[PDB]
Every structure is written in C-alpha cells, then in structure tokens.
C-alpha cells in the first residue's frame, strides 16, 4: 500500500528548492508582552530544519 503522510508534519513543514525544509518558529503564539521585540522580530521569519532533525521530518514526509 501507499505510505501515509504524517499530516501534522505536512501542516508544519515545506520543502525548499534543494530539498531542505522551512518551518515556523515556536514561542510566538502567546505570553508576548514580556518578550523583547528583538526576539519576536527574529522569530517571525521562517527558519530551516536542522541537520539533526531533518531525518525525522523526511520519515514523516515521504511525498515531499
């Protein structure tokens, strides 16, 4: 049978041009008045998935 996609990781990760994955940062959903604006400003843009955790993502997202 076909492999089934982990639908949470499909809602959390997107494959880039060379095969890397972009993702949203954490810590930007609530509790936001005590955090510095510099921290939030460095949390708005999407970041790349690291080399260590890139294997678990590919295992969860077999169909790109």
């Amino acid at each position: 049978p076909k492999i089934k996609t982990v639908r949470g990781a499909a809602k959390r990760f997107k494959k880039t041009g060379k095969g890397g994955f972009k993702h949203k940062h954490a810590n930007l959903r609530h509790i936001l008045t005590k955090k510095a604006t510099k921290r939030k400003r460095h949390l708005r843009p999407k970041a790349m998935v690291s080399k260590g955790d890139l294997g678990l993502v590919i295992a969860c997202l077999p169909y790109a």
């Binding site: 990781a9 959390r12 678990l56």
Partner: protein, 96 residues
C-alpha cells in the same frame, strides 16, 4: 518522529498557512513548450490538447525558461517580462 516520550518536532512546531485552491488550477509554461502546439497560437485549449497543463487548469503564465525560435501568438495568458521580450524578439504577438 518518536523521540522517546519527548515532544516530537512536528508538535513542538506550530502550524502555519492555508492551501489555495486556485493554485491547483494554475500552471506555469516554459517558452520551450510554445513550439509543441500547432497553429502557432497558444491557448489553454491548445496547451491541454498538447498535454502540457492539464484539463482542470484555468490560468497559466509564460515564464522565461528555455527559449523559443518561432513567432507564436499568445492569447488570454499572462506573460512575464523576459518571456515577453523573447516572444516579441522572435516575432510573437502577445494579446488577450
């Protein structure tokens, strides 16, 4: 994604975005695909007859990728700037 009982990465991280239904019915076209049609005119029904974009597609852009060596009338499609220059240099006539 099981990390022991540690909270896995696909749940530490937040969901984002939504899915555009219009993107599934949009398509992009090479300049090299413009010669594969017949009649020298390029429509949606011509590209679908040439099996390029697919049946359910309703919108298409032409992008500077590849190169064309023949004058082709483009009708009812968006064209990028570099594809507009390459089509008009090869003799094309972009219209609506």
């Amino acid at each position: 994604g099981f990390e022991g009982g540690q909270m896995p990465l696909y749940r530490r991280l937040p969901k984002f975005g939504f899915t555009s239904r219009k993107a599934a019915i949009t398509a992009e076209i090479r300049l090299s695909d413009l010669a594969k049609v017949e009649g020298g005119v390029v429509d949606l029904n011509t590209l679908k007859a040439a099996n390029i974009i697919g049946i359910q597609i309703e919108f298409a852009k032409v992008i500077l990728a590849g190169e064309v060596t023949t004058p082709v009338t483009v009708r009812g499609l968006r064209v990028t700037k570099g594809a507009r220059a390459a089509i008009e240099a090869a003799g094309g006539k972009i219209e609506e």
